[model samples]
Target: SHMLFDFENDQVPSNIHFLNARASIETYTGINGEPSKGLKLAMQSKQHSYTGLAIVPEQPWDWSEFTSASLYFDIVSVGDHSTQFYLDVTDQNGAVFTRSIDIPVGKMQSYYAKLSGHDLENDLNLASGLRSNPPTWTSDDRQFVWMWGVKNLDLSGIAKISLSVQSAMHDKTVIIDNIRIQPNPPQDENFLVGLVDEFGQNAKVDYKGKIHSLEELHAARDVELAELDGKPMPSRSKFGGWLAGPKLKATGYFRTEKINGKWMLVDPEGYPYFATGLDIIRLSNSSTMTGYDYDQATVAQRSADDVTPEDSKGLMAVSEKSFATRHLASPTRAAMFNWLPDYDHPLANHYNYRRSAHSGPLKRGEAYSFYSANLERKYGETYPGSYLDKWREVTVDRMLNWGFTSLGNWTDPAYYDNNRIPFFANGWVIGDFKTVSSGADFWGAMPDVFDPEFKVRAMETARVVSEEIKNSPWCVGVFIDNEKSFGRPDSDKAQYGIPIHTLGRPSEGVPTRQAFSKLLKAKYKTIAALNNAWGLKLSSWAEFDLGVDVKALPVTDTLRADYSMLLSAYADQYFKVVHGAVEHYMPNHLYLGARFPDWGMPMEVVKAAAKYADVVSYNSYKEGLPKQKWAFLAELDKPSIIGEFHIGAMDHGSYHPGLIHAASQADRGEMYKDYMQSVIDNPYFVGAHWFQYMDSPLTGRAYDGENYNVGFVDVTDTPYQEMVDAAKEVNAKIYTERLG
Candidate 1:
């Protein structure tokens, strides 16, 4: 493929625009340039604003001759801040594809944005970045996959491209040069080669003790399967006996109680159950985006333009353009693997595609679960997805073998009543309800508990979740609302989340405001009395009822009790609503408090949680058992669970090391032990659940682009022996250790 616009001519090309709001591009003599050109593009953004630059060719350079191609360029930020930008492209018919590319500030890096299909991560979208900003940008905070990109995008039809500096709130300048394309290394096909695993495939992982080949993996699988099913792994209580611990009495159902000065979970059979398990233990983490390029391929057109084919969703689809069907099928890596069985063959059943990826470069493309394929290689599928049935049973044994008492949140509900592993039930309270803010409402806004509609919706959500559990004794508790924005009583974004937002918005007819007013009125005889206590100079009860500016009130305890009381009211109201629903249906299960992530909780919210929750839950991601961060929990004196936490390493074949990183796999082991020791040493903690069982799809989750090596096992279902060994050592001491 010919160069699109090399920009090596040392001049601003004819049709491009600077498109800056207080922003501009400069090639001043003193400004640095790429070795290939005297002229280079350097953008200066607004101090408090944004910028945009567009590229449109006078004549379209056709890419139809190539199978695949990418827009390659180098960018470096002028500041220390890691700013983000959006690279957008348009097809011949103006079909759009957009990608949010981050410019690693202070460093020169080459960026490749696929105009055609390749890795889901690097590909541009037809239309993207359409979603509410904060929450969907993360996870079930639903801040994930703002993929506005379309699939099977017509690459050769690309007609326009633009590099828009979306925001530069921090700094003004970013340098760019050497714009080019590679359709054939020249449009490279390396994306597919990266994921094309062969017989000798092995990762240069650090903490993974032994990297293995297919035969080794198969042998390990066979031995472990037999050992687990036949002679169950030991070091457990009669309730899976652990020699280091005493056998506590067993109950018929999972329940919680304070034994001595410590909080403990009692197994259905009555023994102490230290909930140690992984989340998403199912096979959802197997596949990844197909790593292939087709834009530059010598693809032949289908002779019959009127023909129909099966779309990704399995519907008969008509094509707007003539193309070969062979591209999305077997010629791709998902089908090219030797593990793939021939037509009507057995292994063929193992191959499947996720129209939606949890994480990856592309918005959508082909993905195959080698884990699933390996499962077929392990045990024959009795029926479609039955490998998972075998997998579920094997997983149950694995948990027991590994000394896990309860499965964490989001485990497949099919395993809910298994009578083997206890698990937590979860649900979301999403509906038409009046909302309130906690000032720190970054994840999302909180519900106005004072709203009668909210009460109704809360019960509605609770009812469905309870029915799903059906009062199963194996069910440990119900976790309603993941990471609620109770507001930060102590941080900058506090006003952005909860109680702060509520306090500031005391307007009439607002549910929280009215409720706050009602409380003050009930506590004080008159408006004067209320104002006296609140240290506010309100005119009358009516005026007070109307709402006052929170800034007008004193920050002393006069409002401290008031704020906490109202926050407690809101928090308790939530627990009361949801728990009441659980009581109505399956009262046997515990009412697990909202899973609070770090920075999510305001102390008032935490106090309110302790009021009704059977066990307070938190997703703490810090260096260790959250000793410093969770010190407040100690004074609060509530039984809690580390709902999620993990340490990832880069030695694995994974891309990112993870949020909590370790230098090597060995270090990951040490870190896991150190963190677990923190949990075991903390009297305020009941147990801890690992974030997940499997490493996420190499591309990332279909929801969020979190490609971290934080899995208990790798993409191929290979366990991290270092982590596993550490787990066994700690789990062996968990009960006895907690006895401390």
Candidate 2:
């Protein structure tokens, strides 16, 4: 193993700065190292260049003798930006052999890449490589295997290898470690090996990689087994194993179509179906308090030790009772004094108490415990064991009694097995995949689907989920993945950078840059052609690659085409990844693409999805379908489903404000009726499902801290009277009016 810049020996510069932050120096060796303290480098927003470890392989070595090079590093954090690591190998003439790899920052993880032959030319396919500007130049076509080499040197006679980290804007830090040089290992032989090798010692069965060709694969299995058994054994009254095997089948069907004009899901017979359901809060027992509570004295002591009350108010007004009280009281003084009879209502009382609650001291530890325990004791027994199962049964009974059709996304698996109601199965494919911006809110990081590993993980996830619920017709289809940021249409973030804005870099060297580069290369080919098309003078594509923080070029028809093409590429990749996964495991079922929010899915993306998916799904919160808006689906002419659409009623048992404020219980019922009618009337909408079954716990839950309060039932396990009445009217007539 050749040694690179090992921080343990203090060879690399100690004062290295990343993203404008000072890098700390210490022995970062293996798992024992304080990985976070390794090094930090600040990146300039547009420059595709940064400082990294440099090392000279031991003297008297043949660089051309090595067939491949391997570098190992641990990513500490991506820090709201995208970064790349490059290996620059140069000969004496300055002819450079360069290879770059993109690394997304998050949890600490290891990565490896192999460099050999003309595979380096594959870089041209990357977005950065396609640009008129490329970061570095390289030209070599040889497969060498060398532990040490000496033929390579730069123009200045500097024959050394170097690694550099570069990004635009936000700094990314990765721990370099365990640099090793070794021959590329052969592919796993057992990867294609099938299960029917009974001899176990010498028998080897290759089924090929035809995971989709079930008939061929099954035939292969049968043949392999027959050969092992030496003529098939005679059929007996009972075969080995249990009398009954896993015989579960998909229990529902989901499809999207136009109804009246709006996109929705219809029954198998083409009847409009509305899904009214609930979401359970904290399915697992967990803490409910927004913040930890301590004994009053302990809390007081801690608060006193931290800061004085008056000073604390200055630092954070929200935490100050005096400020909160004053803010809440000033707005309602007249109403509080009963000077306005209109304000003397139950809502007024609620508002006043809410204000008081916000400003008052939080309950002490024991007080909070008492409050939570009391609520749990009262409501915990309402629906005993397996809360999700009971809720599904309740929902199905209501659907049958009130005339609804099925359950919505995130419905528990127990309900899927009940075989009483139609429901959709959902799975999330989350791992170390590359992700781009989808224009939606970027809570954090996006998985890169372009990464080969993502394909494996995604396919495995689909296989497991499909195996869990296969064959039955009750399952309409699977919602592959979930809401992902795929870059927005016409947004500055979408136009200039990688799909994900978090990976910040201004040059044509980042992933987004690389993608843009590839696009330019494909469209214009030569640098002169790109310059002529874009009306810019660039020395070469490499200059373009290294150019940072360039002004936003005004969008022209040409630019629009280029941008749209980029967006299409992103969506295409997403659909391909998910579609391939589902097709591999559950080819018989429909693929209901993850429901897109109105502002999220662009026309190009949706159109791409329409080409692959059986149904396009949307999660809408609007009360009714806008007739004019239905044209979007009409253009595609593909069936669609409202994977989720709901109206939370305040008058319902829920203590929180509903999405649409209603004046009374009757108003809530009227809203539900109108919403249902609109869905039913929409020609493009085949079916729709209400969001959830139960009100969120008043205290909230983990993962989703808050902002979710869209359930049909309250914490008390009682259905809202208004919604129930509305369901009775709408569900009863939905089948007759829509399906008939």
Candidate 3:
């Protein structure tokens, strides 16, 4: 092992320097409880920006002598809040790959990252087993949990290594030691093999509430039902509105109003309603790909005909190809399971096939839902006769018991008819239409609103949503889309990716491209005048229409002014068309705007939504809606609701703690309460919804490899008691706090 910088010599490394951060050699009780020197790094930021340390090793070291190499480090977050940081590994060719780390506060975890030589294209071509170097850290068995997929880099010439913290909210500290690169770390040959038990649980480690027998699984629900049998719903109206508050005008539908200088969602019964809700309340995401596929399977064709176009229910796209499986794409992934029911077995009904993947070793593979299978095992012969039917009933019961005011986005339609709770209807506008890039299209490209096909698809999806909800008064509002690629709100260039991309294309080929050309023509009247203003020496308008790389030109005030106009026009067109379609289909319902991401919502997009939407929606995945991040909402003065947010932990036998982290289950509950209270106290916020109902599969979801512990319940159909208690405490007093 080659030590990078151990600080054991009691001196700071001269090769390392801080960037928006401060660090020094400090003495602390190390992981082994020995008094030792470590790098005490403190992140410093005046506002949200990158802050961390960078190490440009003495020189680019060549590790080509080793068969396989790995980077090992020991780190502990010293702040009260959880820390998320990224490690970037760069090679001599300037190719850099990154790994994100989410560390819980006060927990000393050993981080082991294996370096691979394959780039993404070659990496995807290889077998899944070969894609990753298994068993990187085997000595610290319990803490060897934070595993990242291998990066494709030329390890022959390793260059600078940088650790950066993105959007630091406050000052954070971490003690680090033992930064070393090893030729070959200790390997547990049987690490991936037999990692999962018969019950779809972690087979290697024992934790609290581990069901050892089928009898215990069968009896768990009966005890919970008995405890909840006589429980009463919270003191609220039939619509989960504030029952004890002063009544407002009854419109017989959900509406937003500003009373006493605070925004509120007034219920159909005229009482103030705040939507404390839960999202992804369905069995759709519970499936995990088993890393095995049919020997002669083909990718399935999927369309955007459904309400949610992105969710093809785990079907494959036409462009992907598949090889023989059952033959293993990932033998290591297959070996992780101790037992899986055969295709002809009784429990095989839980098996599902998925071909479309966001990112993973296997693009298409057979998936199994341990959570769905456990549901059957728990209530196979119950009073409702069908396990799914019984599960739905129990789910509705739990929502009421847990004090969630309504069902959030992507909830199953099974609960719509019951009218037991209100829900937000959701739809996506997707089809064969022209699209534009925001440069950071995390999900996919944005629709070209000027295209006729986009409007057709928008109406088509609204029709599907209308049919599903059936004009039920229980529907709180309708969400047209989610987290559209409207560019970022941060920089002038980033916020105008749509305009920049459009300007770079031939005007005759794209609708938005032509529109941009026309806008410029109408403004300046001639190419000569346009060139004078933009400081460009274009020959003629024909050349301008032919296409120009706007990014290559100087970023001037005139250029930004034109970009802003085009960006605003594009956003306005999108919201207007989508909102119009929803109004035409569901005339009486509120048109909840497309859920904006906290990071991506541009000012133009927000203004467009405020002009048209009944209540703006945002997915805030932070401690709370920060005052600085949301101070603009006060000026907009429109009622808003949080579409999704969550806090996850690893105390319950999971690998990842999701986007946000907590130290333990109890801390998760406390954090949940604090987050909810933050929303409750905000005048502009009506309510918030937790991201999901159940934890993701222990390995990863079939569609994407998001194996997060961000659920109110585990795979075994047992609720996290801390989460339940937190909801009860927060929802019980939300209205009172908001009214104050």
Candidate 4:
């Protein structure tokens, strides 16, 4: 093992600095119970989305000799909660070998990472990026293999390394030590072997509902259908609102109003409503890559054929070049399955294609859905009462029987007109537009609101959403976007990342930079005045127009105040334009703002949302909404809703217990009930919606490899009994509980 760096000297390496946070050399108890020095990376507050210990070695290290080896390190979280630490290594050949591993709280653990050397050609695909629809990039590849890198990563020129903590709801620290490159580490010759069984379950482990045959799967479905038919929906108004709860003014549309100082979601039927339901209730995201690509002949053969329904429904598009079986796009992935039906086999209908990836090394690959295959087996796929229809019916029945009041975000459009349950509509604003960095662009860069293309895209999203929902009375609201990269407000640098980045850019064709320049010129009257206020020595206004290094500028009172004003105006324009579009297209429905990530929500953005949105939305990933963290709501005095949250456990076969973890299935349920209670007790929150409906595949989801055990139902469409029980207990008494 070649030592890279260590803190035995009790000094922080000059090569090391915490990006967006702080770091220090601290004396801590090592894994072996000896007092030792290690670099402690600390996120001082919860406002930042991510903070990283960046390592720019004194010089690029040559690791060509250790290409077949691994980089080893020890990490331990000193925080109250467990967290994921990502390691991103960039090479001179324009490739980044990226990977992450979970660091359990207070437990020091050693981990190693490499390309796995089995299929360097395909292993490179893992390095590209993890992409998802609502933008869950951090948890992408949750339970999959350890590492992914890209093509031509010249190990001889290892340029840089970074370890980061993302999406933490509270301040935390991770200590690291014993960094080294270990040569000729023992390799798993059968690393890809026998990961998934024929039933789509983890072949290496067995759990409670592990099915051995189609007969058993069908029998399970029958039992569930019988139970569902026998159980009637609980007492509720026509809109699933509280039937016995206090009545409000009838409006024939969902609206937000404060009642007795508590923000409430008033249903079309004029009763207090608490929207509670699952998300991603669709077969589209259930597919996983088969690690195969279409051979040349297959690609040529499919050129004349039209795309299938299954292909069109996926996150990526299907193309003529997207067919393959034995040819591996990701050999490391292909080796995981114990069995995959042949292309000519009947179950091969479950096969699909992904033409692109949100992020990752493999841009495209063949895909498969054992979940959909199982659904076809549970209910025949042919004709009149197809598997899809049966699934939808059962899904609606389950929601009603289990006491869920509404369908959450990212639901399949097939359920839009069902009229059985209230549902939240959602859309994304994506297009060819100028963008700005928020410094920590986890999901991607922020859309530059000053760019006219952004408004066009926003309006396009709202128009499409209006068409999809068709002004259905069952529609509760519309979430126009997921998490935006607004940057955090914890530090001056982070809080003004957008304006700083904008101002540093060439003003030509960059509307955001031009707007900031205009605002400054109007306020300061001359470049001389601006220089005095910002403590700069610019020659003229032309120099400012050319672009100034905002990062290097002094952080003075006037400068800070001006940056805050500009950031506020930027957010205001964004919300106002999006809100205008939503109001124009869907006037009757509540305009639920973009679901802000817990880490990315800046006070300026929140206040802007409060101004234009009927209900401000946030995605909270904690045990409960702690009063200390959410106390800001008192001043905002606006209605809010939790767009996403969940708890997962390792009791099941899942390797990762989702973003927030519990000890077991029982504890997961207990946490869920408590979370719901917390929401009900909060006067600012109108509702809370659980993240999703199904557990990710045992391997990982196709788009981003997220294999979280955060579903009410498993891949086999079987409900987690404990989750079901918990939802019933919570939903049945939610209105009364909140009212009291």
Candidate 5:
């Protein structure tokens, strides 16, 4: 009775009906309705009716020949209607061998599904064949390979396979085609010729060719696997590397330590580590000059029209041509400002081109030019080949001459290699991972740590970085990720949310939700028990999994407890994934978990991290750690580090003060002092690093539109005098003396 259904003539038996009117055999690739060329297929929608099925293959696959089964599909849309495709391969006795393929949808895309050996054995009773689990899938709802394998589906002569589609949406449409079944290929003889057989057999061949003893081959394979697992080195030098290498002696909170019943960083042998630094913006000094002299000559080059009397009058009113043209023409401009008479000017700076920079009264114009030039003249250019390095060298010589121990995160990598100043390596992780929204302007999307693919990528990134600086003691542990807004202030949505909460019910059926549901089921035992605790009556676990609007309720003790547990779970998963990778690759380094904002991390999350992280880190902005906050360290009893803390000066070209509130250069410096002293004085606090070494350009940065003047230096690459003076005073006894 088993037969392949041919859609070529609409010959699928009437008994095998399409779930909805959506099913059709079109030229489109897979389920998402997109075309496929080569190996890619796009499935447009996940509606149930879109799937076309056929009876199983005639020959029962031999246990050895059918090594794996895979489902390939492209994603077109996501959420609702998306569900796994079920395969029911049965024997003559009507016993079913079942497996499922996750059908992701978005835009047309292709995916390969590899059948896992273990799942086939465990889930479907296919126990006697070769088995392996593939890496977790990474493609979004667009397209990806969905694979599952029966270790040994002994269908050498057996017949009949049944395939069906399941959809979250009753009317969802998913296109599927190009189903193929073939025997597994023979192993490559040349590649595996020297592989060792069990019990030390195959003693005649060499490891590769000559030393072919089975023991030798097994040992060689072990070595190769070890090599493959090793961390990857950085392709190019990073900014943090430029600091703590040759230029300075760096020290700080490498990890949390407990001493005298208090949590704190182990004291640096003699001197305390104080980071008093500046963030210098890399803006072109030459561009500032050209915009200053926006006369007929400049306007003529930019536009063909001659300047009218009225245009000239208006331009002249704001033009610095009288003062700037002569300056631009002077040889001194070329020597000092790097100005190219014909090509360079303030408007030419890259930042001036972005919409964020030109928006509002701060529009790019001559006035901006003059102000920028003035700032440059005052600060000096810090660009590599410019005065910036000279200033940085002098600044470090000053910090050393003055008494600071290290430069902080984002202190150019040149400083790391040359200056010998210890600093943290930083990176931004942005991808398709689940996200949680934090209400404050400071919020960015929070990554879902529970996603295995995200974990793999994050670990890969961390391992690559660790490999770049392997065994270098000067390189303290790496700050794996940055100021993620996982915590939100008092909003009910903030308190009772998960990063995956945004995807709503239909999306939750994915692996992350399945894992979470499994965890909840394992812990709570019953839906009634979960309902009693959360004050919700879900008809069933399926309803809970498929239900949207999960966070409509106000905060309660039960909600807080559950939310804290969830936060703990998230943090635990993140710490374990990252820490495990770091330990596996570069065991010598510390795993400085992503810096948590004061408002973002729940207490349970911190406690959870303290269990694994060498340094429990935070990105604090407070001028001083408030007395009440001392309890956090005491409670966790772990060494803690302020991963990032800085106050920006608005008096500089930066249009905004960063997250922390400091109004002027003096205020920022004083705040820096107050903050550092508070960190040092706390017995539980081990060390703190400034957020950055350079100020962002006034034109605003790429991602956040941030133009904060938070650097230790100004846009022109000049160090703020008062901040330097403050550093000099504080660095002298950062560990011993406390500032009130």
Candidate 6:
């Protein structure tokens, strides 16, 4: 046994730095009921906080000799039942991997994380894993959880480690002991897996809406389609609003107001509306690339009209030949399905492939929408694209029936024209910009708002998005661009990214760098004075003009303070530019600001948004509602919308346990209720949108291989009964709970 640190001596191990923790420690006996006295690091958790003691070895551990680590700890969830804590491992090379621990009460536990279990790939900015900068510190976990997957990491230099609770809120005292790293676990190749089916393998869920098999699935769909686009829930208000809610001053269109100090979305008919939204309601974004299988894929082809287009080849993308990489990972996933997708079959209409994927193969790759094919089978094909029309109708009614007030961001363009259910419009500005890194740029660098072209591009995007909105009364607002590099305000180089990332560029024609230079010149009187303040030694203003390497040099308090102000100005400029464009094109619509994740928001951005936008929106994926950052929202004094939030379970037919998790489908529903209560009770929150309507394909989605149980409905378009049941309970009382 590799006895790395035996705490029998009850002394602080040499080089164990108690970095930043809210708790004190001592030695204890009866660890896991063993009589040996052990070192203890305990937190009363007075309340939930991301407080931790970072332990770093004086020299990096040579863990390349080992392939796994077992965190042996005696844990008890004394103050609460269980808590989601994190163990972050940073190798000497700076590659980071995190492990989430479910600290159940009253037990000794041994949790092992394989060194190569998950990677921290740059493609996983929107995934449900831990990352270099974990997201659920308060925002939407699904979108912001930087639980990145890595491809190549240096295991040779296992360097720093830290542990803390409250990526999920909890109060507890945990005693950790006997942590060791060892060689990889032995394995036998049975090649068996559970939770791979549509209902989720072995997911014998017994609920009102449970579809146990294909037959049950058909029966359920038939029943749903029959009533879809029909009468909505009896409790709904006119224009599909929540009935029994207070009616506000109607200006003949949707708007917002502060009633008794709480913000509410006033419906078109003057009803105090709370937007309960379902996002990505369209039939696209579901296909997964299956183009090149393991070369062993004997694709069932019928006259080759199968999903393979006459102009294209339908094959899975593989990095190497079968004998070499064994045609990797593709076959193992595709083999999960009992039914081979019939490409030329009437069901083949839904099969589509992509040449470019945001996450998977960049070249031509095969993809299929099992949900689409299943839709065809569920409803007999009435005519070409007629079933699609039927699908739209049925979905609209599903929202009406399901009690959703509006369609959320990223809904299909096809559904926007239809006035059946109210929905918000979304678009992205993807044109080339003089982008600047937010030091910790997650989904890419922030667009250079300082550039003149950015203003032009913002207008161009607004022009196109506005045409779709077309001043419809049903249109809620516009939520454009997603979580961007707004930069962490307090921390300049480490957490704050925007200004420092720009400094890495020379003060050439780069718009952001140029702006930073202008800002510095305005603040500083002389070159030497500027250098003294910023901890640099420049001889001339021209030398100062050439941006300094703040990353290379230590960041001084004066430099950090200056950086904060400049970063805020940059954010302020961005809000002004984008808001100006959107308002110019569609003045009638609400300009809900950027769906800022937990990471990229600084006070400057929020202040600027409150000056122009209707609702300050956030994409928060957490256990209940966000509590840490509400002080800022309250101070900003604007209506805030939860752009995205959801709870997912692995027990039901889903793969990953979404960014937020639950014990079972029922538990997920119950959690949803608690979360909604928080949203409704929060005086500033006007609405909250679920991340999506349907689940991503069993294979990851084309955008970013995110396959999670986050959707309200699964791949087969069947709603999760537990979640639906939970939604019904909370949504029904949202208006009353909110108003009261």
lDDT of 5: 0.45
Model 1 agreement with the true structure over 1-740: per-residue lDDT tens digits: 45555455556676676665333344422123334442233444433233666777676657665555556666655544343556777777766765553444454655665555333223221111111111101111100112344544566566677776532323335666656775523323432333324321222223343435667777767766766752234544444323343445656666666666777777666666677878766555455334332332332332221111111122112121212222453243342233333325554443333333322334344444556666665666577667768878887877777767678877767788776667878767766677887654544567788788876776777777776788777787887777776765453334223444565665575887777767777889787887678677888877765545675444566666667777777777787777676666666778888888866676766777887888899887644653345679768778888889887754565544555555467767776787788788877778888887887654444333455667887765667778878887887788777664
Worst 10 residues of 2 by lDDT: 232-241
lDDT of 1: 0.59
Global local distance difference test of model 3: 0.76
Count clashing pairs, candidate 4. Answer: 13
Query: Tell me, what's the RMSD of every candidate?
Result: 14.1, 29.8, 4.2, 7.4, 28.9, 7.4
Q: What would the TM-scores of all predictions be?
A: 0.62, 0.51, 0.89, 0.77, 0.51, 0.81
lDDT of 6 by residue, 595-636 (tens): 888776777677777887889998877766546646667778
Q: Rate the local accuracy (lDDT) of all candidates.
A: 0.59, 0.46, 0.76, 0.75, 0.45, 0.64
Error of 1 at 439 (Å): 3.6
Q: Is candidate 1 or candidate 3 better by lDDT?
A: 3
* Candidate 5 to native Cα RMSD, angstroms: 28.9
Among these predicted structures, which one has the highest lDDT? 3
Best-first order by lDDT: 3, 4, 6, 1, 2, 5
Regions of model 6 farther than 4 Å from truth: 1-46, 51-64, 68-82, 92-95, 101-110, 116-121, 125-146, 149-163, 167-183, 187-213, 223-236, 239-246, 293-342, 361-364, 488-490
Cα shift from native, residue 278, model 5 (Å):
5.8
The runs of at least 3 residues in candidate 1 whose Cα sits more than 4 Å from the true structure, single-residue gaps closed, are 1-220, 230-251, 283-380, 489-497, 503-509, 521-561, 626-628
Per-candidate clashes, comma-separated: 73, 108, 0, 13, 95, 32
**Native-to-model Cα distance after best TM-score fit, residue 410 in candidate 4, in Å:** 1.0
Check candidate 3 and list the clashing pairs.
Answer: none
Sorted on TM-score, best first, the list reads 3, 6, 4, 1, 5, 2
Compose the digit string of candidate 5's lDDT tens values, residues 1-740.
11123244533344433333334345445444445422121222233323434344444544344455443333332333333445555554444445443343444434343332323321211111101111222233221111233334444433455445421212334544344442222323232122112111122222212223335434533443343322212210122221111222234324334444434332222122223333221232212212222333533223212211111111222334422443222221122122222224432222121111112222223322222333333334556235445444554554444344555554444555543345455433445566444333243455656676666666666555655564465555666666565656556566445623632544362554555666677878888998887788888777777854555666677766656666667667767877777677667667767788766676666776788788777877545576555566776666677867776643442324554544356656666776777776776666676755555433333222244456555433334667666766666554334321
* Candidate 4 to truth, TM: 0.77
